[PDB]
Paper text:
The spike (S) protein is the major surface antigen of [name]-[name]-2. The S protein uses its receptor-binding domain (RBD) to engage the host receptor angiotensin I converting enzyme 2 (ACE2) for viral entry. RBD-targeting antibodies could then neutralize [name]-[name]-2 by blocking ACE2 binding. To understand the molecular features that endow IGHV3-53 with favorable properties for RBD recognition, we determined the crystal structures of two IGHV3-53–neutralizing antibodies, [name].1 and [name].3, in complex with the [name]-[name]-2 RBD and with the cross-reactive Fab [name] to [name]-like CoVs.
We determined four complex crystal structures, [name].1/RBD, [name].3/RBD, [name].1/RBD/[name], and [name].3/RBD/[name], at resolutions of 3.20, 2.33, 2.70, and 2.90 Å, respectively. [name].1 and [name].3 were previously isolated from a [name]-[name]-2–infected patient and were shown to be specific for the RBD. [name].1 and [name].3 [median inhibitory concentration (IC50), ~20 ng/ml] were among the top four highly potent neutralizing antibodies in the panel of antibodies assayed against live replicating [name]-[name]-2 virus and pseudovirus. Although [name].1 and [name].3 are both encoded by IGHV3-53, [name].1 uses IGHJ6, IGKV1-9, and IGKJ3, whereas [name].3 uses IGHJ4, IGKV3-20, and IGKJ1. Among 17 ACE2-binding residues on RBD, 15 and 16 are within the epitopes of [name].1 and B38, respectively, and 11 are in the epitope of [name].3. The buried surface area (BSA) from the heavy-chain interaction is quite similar in [name].1 (723 Å2), [name].3 (698 Å2), and B38 (713 Å2). By contrast, the light-chain interaction is much smaller for [name].3 (176 Å2) compared with [name].1 (566 Å2) and B38 (495 Å2), consistent with different light-chain gene usage. For example, whereas CDR H3 of [name].1 interacts with RBD Y453 through a hydrogen bond, CDR H3 of [name].3 and B38 do not form such a bond. Although the CDR H3 sequences of [name].1 and [name].3 differ, both are nine amino acids in length (Kabat numbering). Longer CDR H3s cannot be accommodated in these IGHV3-53 antibodies because their epitopes are relatively flat, with only a small pocket to insert their CDR H3 loop.
Numbering used by the authors:
A (entry chain B): 1 to 82, 82A, 82B, 82C, 83 to 100, 100A, 101 to 127, 133 to 215
B (entry chain H): 1 to 52, 52A, 53 to 82, 82A, 82B, 82C, 83 to 100, 100A, ...
C (entry chain A): 1 to 95, 95A, 95B, 96 to 213
D (entry chain L): 1 to 27, 27A, 27B, 27C, 27D, 27E, 27F, 28 to 215
E (entry chain C): 334 to 445, 448 to 528
The structure:
Amino acid sequence: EVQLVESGGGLIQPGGSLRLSCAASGLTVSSNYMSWVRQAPGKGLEWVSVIYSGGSTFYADSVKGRFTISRDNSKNTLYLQMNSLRAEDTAVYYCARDLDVYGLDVWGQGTTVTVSSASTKGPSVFPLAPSGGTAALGCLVKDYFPEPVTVSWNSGALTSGVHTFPAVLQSSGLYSLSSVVTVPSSSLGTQTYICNVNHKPSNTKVDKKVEPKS
Amino acid sequence: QMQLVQSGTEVKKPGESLKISCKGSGYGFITYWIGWVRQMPGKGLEWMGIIYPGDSETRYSPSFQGQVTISADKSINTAYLQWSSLKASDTAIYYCAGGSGISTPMDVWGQGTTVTVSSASTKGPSVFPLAPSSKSTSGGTAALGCLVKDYFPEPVTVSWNSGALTSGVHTFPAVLQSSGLYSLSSVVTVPSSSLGTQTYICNVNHKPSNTKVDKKVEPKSC
Amino acid sequence: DIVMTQSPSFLSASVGDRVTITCRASQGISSYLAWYQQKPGKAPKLLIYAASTLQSGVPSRFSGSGSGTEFTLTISSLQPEDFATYYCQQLNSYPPKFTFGPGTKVEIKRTVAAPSVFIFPPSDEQLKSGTASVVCLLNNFYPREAKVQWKVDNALQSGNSQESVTEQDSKDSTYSLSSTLTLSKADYEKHKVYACEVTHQGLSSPVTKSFNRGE
Amino acid sequence: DIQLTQSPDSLAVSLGERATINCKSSQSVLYSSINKNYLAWYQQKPGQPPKLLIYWASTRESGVPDRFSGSGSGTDFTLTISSLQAEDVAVYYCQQYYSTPYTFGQGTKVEIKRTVAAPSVFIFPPSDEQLKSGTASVVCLLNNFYPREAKVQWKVDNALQSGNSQESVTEQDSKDSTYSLSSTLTLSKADYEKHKVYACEVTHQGLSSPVTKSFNRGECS
Amino acid sequence: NLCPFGEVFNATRFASVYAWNRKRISNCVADYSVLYNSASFSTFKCYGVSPTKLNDLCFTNVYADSFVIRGDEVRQIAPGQTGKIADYNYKLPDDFTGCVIAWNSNNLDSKVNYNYLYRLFRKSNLKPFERDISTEIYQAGSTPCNGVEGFNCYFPLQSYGFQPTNGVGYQPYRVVVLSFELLHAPATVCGPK
Ligand SMILES: *[C@@H]1O[C@H](CO)[C@@H](O[C@@H]2O[C@H](CO)[C@@H](O)[C@H](O)[C@H]2NC(C)=O)[C@H](O)[C@H]1NC(C)=O
C-alpha cells in the first residue's frame, strides 16, 4: 500500500509564494524520479517539475525561474516552492513517481492552488422545498469563494438519489452550487431531511432543514 | 585553414532592428566556436558572447546578456548577431572571431562590420578651400588644403590632382559634430615656388550620397 | 519540441462496444509512450507504458499498440465505469518535457431516457437578502443535450440563467442538470407566473413545470 | 570576473630596441592539470582586425617572427618585442580565455620613438564661400611633429575660446614617424564678423616658446 | 608508430554507454588532422585544447572513450551537464580537457530493433570517469529486493528503442571522447612535430 499525499494548497494573491508538500509512504522519495504535474481547471495535464535520485532537477519552461522542486529524505517528503505566482498557475497539483519507461505509475490525489486577489467568503444556504410517487428537494449553496464546498444529507446517512452539481462561477466572481435528492413523497412528512454544507476555506458549517410548504 | 567573412556596412536609425552575419569557409569549421567582439570608435576590444554552431550552445557576457542575440545556422556555416532595437551607443565595429574550441584563443577573425546608428540623414559634403597664405616664406614651404564639412554617413575620399599628388598630403580622420554630421579636412605642403605656376585641385567623393566635387585651391587675390 | 495530438476529442460508445483512441507524435518516438485514464476530479491512473505493455492491475480489455508516429489505445469491450478522459504522454524526452496529449473524453452511450422535471421557487430567507434564484432540475436523462427555456409571464428570458450538469452516473449512465435563473427581489416581485420549459429528445412534446409567486 | 590590466597604455620605442608590455591578471589563469596559462596576445594595426600573436602565454602562432616572445605565469605576464620594427607599430591586447566570459586588456599603443621635431604651424581663415554659408571655420594646422603631445589654444581678440573647437590627429607616418594635427574653431558668421584678430597658439616640446599664428579678419593673408 | 585512432573511430561495433569503452593511447605519433578535417562528424566540441594546435604538443597519455547514445543526449557529454546519461552513465569532470566528437549512426545501429543499453536507476550520481556495470536490482523503497524483480524492485538497465524511422533525437549517435592526461612523467603521445 503505497500512498502519496500532498498538501499546502489554497488561496494566494498574485505575486505571492506558496510551498507544496507531498509526503510518501511505500516508496523512498530520495531514491526515485519524483515529479509535479498540474492541471488547470477544465484543461489537460501539464508536467511542472522533476527531481532525480542523484539530485538533478528539471522544470517546464512555463515555471522556469519561479518554481523550485526539492526533497527531505528524513521526512520522506517532496516539496514544490512556487514564487511570483500568476493566475495562470491556478491548478490542481499532483505529486507523482516517474519510472521513465514504465510511466508515472503512482500519483497523489492532488492539492488545489487558486491564485486570485478576491477574498474568502462563506456561502449562504437556502432550501429547495418539495411539492404522487417521487418528490425532489434540495439545497442552494450561494455566493462563496473559493472552491470547494462539500454537501452531505442527514450527516451522511443518505446517499442514494443525491446529485450535487458542479459549482458555477457567477458574474459576481463568487461560486454557487445546488444539491438535490429525490425521495418518496410518502416520507415527505415522515422523514426529516437536513443538508450539511461545509466550506472549510471560511470554516463555515451550516445544517439546513428542508421542509415542505403550503 | 579557415576564414570568416562578415556582412557589409550598416547605417541605421535609432529603434530599428538589425542582424549582421559572419560566414565561415574552409577546413575544420565543425570544430569552431564563433564569438563576437565590439570595438567602439577609438576604444578597445569587448568580448560580447560566443556560440557553437553545431548545436547553438551560447554563452553571453554579463554586459551584453539581454542586450543582443547571438544565433547560428549550421547549414550555411553562418553565425548571426542581432539587435531588436538599436541605440546610438551601438555605433561601433563588430568583429566575429573563431576559436577551435572553448577556452581556446581566437585564431580566425572576420574583417569587421561597421555599424552607425544615428538619426542623421544622408547628406553630401560641402567643400571649401583652405587657401595658402599670401605671406609665406618665399624660399620655404607653404600649406593649402580642403575643408570637407557637413556630411553623413562615412566615409568620404579625398585625392589631390586626381591622384597625382600624394607626397606631403595629410587627410585627417573625420570628427562627429554637434549636428550629427561628419566633417574632415585634407592638407598639402608644397613649395612656395609653385604657388603661382602649379594648380592644386582637391577631388572629394562621397559614394553614400553619390557626390563628386572638384575644388580648385588658389591664393586668394585679396 | 515534438507535438502530441489525440483524436477524437470526444467519443461516445455503448457498453460492450470496441473503442479506439488515437495518439500521434510529430516525430517518431519508437515505443516511448504511455496511456493514462482520468476520472473527473480524481488523479490519473496509468494504463499502458512502452506503447503496448499493460500496467499491472489494469483490466485486460485495455490494450495499446503502435510505434513511431501513431499509437492507439483500444478498449475491447466498453464498460460503464470506463467513461473518463484518456491522455497519452511522450516518454524519455531530453531535455525533459513530459509532453501530454490533448486528451480524449469517452462518454457511455445508452438508450434515450426522458428527464423528470422539477421547479423550485426562491425561499423567503433568500428574498430577505434582496436576491431571488429560481431553480429547475432535470433528473436522470440521456443524452446530455437538453433545451431549458425560462418563461416569466410567458416572456422568454435570456441572459440570466446558468446551467450545471452532473457527471454521467456510474450505473445507469444518465445525466442530471440544474438551470438557475437569478434576479433581484424587485424584478422577481414584478411578475407572477414562473415556468421552466424543457425540450429533450426523449419527450414527445416540451414539458413545462410552473408556479405562481406566493401560492 | 577575471579582469586584466595592461601597463603602460602607450609606449614609444626606437627602431631595433626592445618593447615590453605587461599584463596583470585579477586571478590566476593556470590550469594545473595541463600546466598552461590561458592567456593570449593580439596585435591590431589601424583599420585591420586583431591578429593572434601568442597563445598559452608563450607559444607563438605560425608566421609570427621570433622577435615576439611571451613570458610570465600565474597573474603576471609580459609580451616582448626584442627589436622593434616599423611593421610592429600597433595596439597590443592581452586576453584571458581561462573561463567564459573572455576579457581583454585595455590595450597598449606602440609607436616609433624618433627625435623631437617641432610642428610647422599654419592658419586658414574661413573661405568666403563658407561665409555665405552662415558658419565660419578657422583651421590651424600643426604639421609633422613628434612626440604627439601638443597644446593648441584659440584666441579671438585675446579672449580664450572654449567649447567651440574640435581637433583631429593622424596616425604615425610610415616614413618619418611624425604626427599631424588640425584644430577647427567653428562659430556663426555673425560672431565671426564681430572680431578682428584670430590667433592660434601652439606649445610643443620642440618649441622653445609658444608659436602663434594669427590673422586679421579682412586683411590679405 | 602512428596512434590507433582508426581502431577507435572506425570500430564496427560500439559499446553501450553504461559499459563505455576506453582505449589508452600511448607511445605513438598522433595526427589529429584526420579528425578535425573530416566531414563525417555531427559534433566536435573541444574544451581547453584546440585540435589544430595539438599536432606539436606532447602528452603523457590520451584516452579515447567510445559509446553510443541518442542524439538528444549528445549535449550531455560535456562538463557541467545533468541528465540520465551524465548522472548515471558517463560523467565528464568540470575541469575536463579534451574533445567530444559525435556522429549520426542511424545507418549502422538501427535495424528492423537493436540492443544498446543505458543505466536508468541509480541511487547517486557517477563520479567523473566512473564505469558502473552492475546489474543489481534497484531498490526503490524500504523492502529489500532479494534479486527478484517486482514493485519498487527494478532492473537497472534499459534498452534504446533504436528504430530506423525514429526522429533524429531518438536515433543512435556514436561518440568518442578524447581526454588528454599530462602527468609529471615521460610524455609518450606527440604530434608529427
Ligand atoms: C575512418 O575511415 C574513413 C573511411 O571511411 C577514413 O577516411 C579517409 O581517410 C583518408 C586518410 O586517412 C582520407 O584521405 C580520405 O579522404 C577519408 N575519406 C573519407 C570518406 O572520410 C578515416 O580516416 C578513418 N578514421 C580514422 C581515425 O582513421
